[PDB]
Design a protein around this nucleic acid. Structure first.
Ligand code: ADE
Ligand code: SF4
Ligand code: CA
Length: 346
DNA sequence: AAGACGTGGAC
DNA sequence: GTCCAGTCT
């Protein structure tokens, strides 16, 4: 019922679509930025960040020209920071080799960093009307129920079948709305738990409702257990009130974000005190707390300490005043290190 | 193929 | 506690 569906869906969309910030216009830059911020992050959490981000980086060019350190700062607390580094590059590429005009050709836009199959379709379909499908988690949930597909949505293969299923039922007349409509539906109706089928605008066409198995779809593999990793962190202060920080390595975990000197303790303050060299003296642990990641959990332990000078501060390290820390981008884990330390000493 | 890659907010 | 939750390698 390719046509009956669209009509029922698109309409529901027209009257139920939320008035979200990135929906004010169809500007390719705005859309692209929100689509990237929304990856594995909830809309409510993204709204504030989006607004600040665009306020500070009004256009693709403004973003293109900004120092990456600023870019990270703007992303501070959002998670999966590699996303903004990829967007910063992609943009710099679009300014230089594309005349500041975001490609409207799948193959083209797709070569930019951070732009996978989903982004290509979301951005080009909503902003440029290109009929490419935009299949993400929500869409896969919706489609898997509508058509009763029981394949693991983890398999990129499934992503392709779902994508194929979109190429045949979408409303080629208005792809962008069809694609967002499908996404809103999964967001406000066809939810992960307790989907509201009784009031769904497309309940009809839903094989899953007919069979009473909607709450059992989509089929997903259960996440495995994550590694637990203890970490020693040093909060070193001068006599004048200056702390020691370093910029993490540009590749891997929390890439390019600043932090307080740390090291894996498989080791106590000994293992940490060693890494210092320097000229630092540490004492008993101020506190110990956890901090989860997708693939592991940090077992943190703070160690206070005085920093006596005796040489330059080079390498990744950097001497910084207290009224200047708030300018660096730190992971949520170390923002708590400082918070714990500051209330301790006060 | 499957692990790497943040962080928070419902149940 | 668990589920949610794209792209790069
Ligand atoms: N364009 C969009 N609008 C609302 N929620 C979304 N989640 C992912 N893309 C979205
Ligand atoms: S009927 Fe229920 S399960 Fe089917 S699409 Fe609508 S909300 Fe989703
Ligand atoms: Ca690509």
């Amino acid at each position: 019922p390719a046509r009956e569906f669209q009509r029922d869906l698109l309409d529901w969309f027209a009257r139920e679509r939320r008035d979200l910030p990135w929906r004010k216009d169809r500007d390719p830059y705005k859309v692209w930025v929100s689509e990237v911020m929304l990856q594995q992050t909830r809309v409510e959490t993204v709204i504030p960040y989006f607004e600040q981000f665009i306020d500070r980086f009004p256009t693709l060019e403004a973003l293109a020209d900004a120092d990456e350190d600023e870019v990270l700062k703007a992303w501070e607390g959002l998670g999966y920071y590699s996303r903004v580094r990829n967007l910063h590059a992609a943009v710099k590429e679009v300014k230089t080799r594309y005349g500041g005009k975001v490609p409207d050709d799948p193959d083209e836009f797709s070569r930019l960093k951070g732009v996978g199959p989903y982004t290509v379709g979301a951005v080009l379909s909503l902003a440029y009307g290109v009929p490419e499908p935009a299949v993400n988690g929500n869409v896969m949930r919706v489609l898997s129920r509508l058509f009763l597909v029981t394949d693991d949505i983890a398999k990129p293969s499934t992503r392709k079948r779902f994508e194929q299923i979109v190429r045949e039922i979408m409303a080629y007349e208005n792809p962008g709305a069809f694609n967002e409509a499908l996404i809103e539906l999964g967001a406000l109706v066809c939810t992960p738990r307790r989907p509201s089928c009784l009031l769904c605008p497309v309940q009809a066409y839903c094989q899953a409702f007919a069979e009473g198995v909607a709450e059992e779809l989509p089929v997903k593999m259960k996440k495995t257990a994550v590694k637990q990793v203890p970490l020693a962190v040093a909060v070193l202060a001068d006599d004048e009130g200056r702390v020691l920080i370093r910029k993490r390595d540009s590749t891997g975990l929390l890439a390019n974000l600043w932090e307080f000197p740390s090291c894996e303790t498989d080791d106590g303050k000994e293992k940490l005190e060693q890494m210092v060299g320097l000229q630092v003296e540490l004492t008993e642990p101020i506190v110990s707390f956890e901090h989860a990641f997708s693939h592991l959990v940090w077992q943190l332990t703070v160690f206070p300490g005085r920093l006596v000078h005796g040489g330059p501060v080079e390498e990744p390290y950097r001497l910084a005043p207290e009224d200047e820390l708030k300018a660096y981008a730190f992971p949520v884990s170390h923002q708590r290190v400082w918070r714990e330390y500051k209330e301790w000493a006060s």
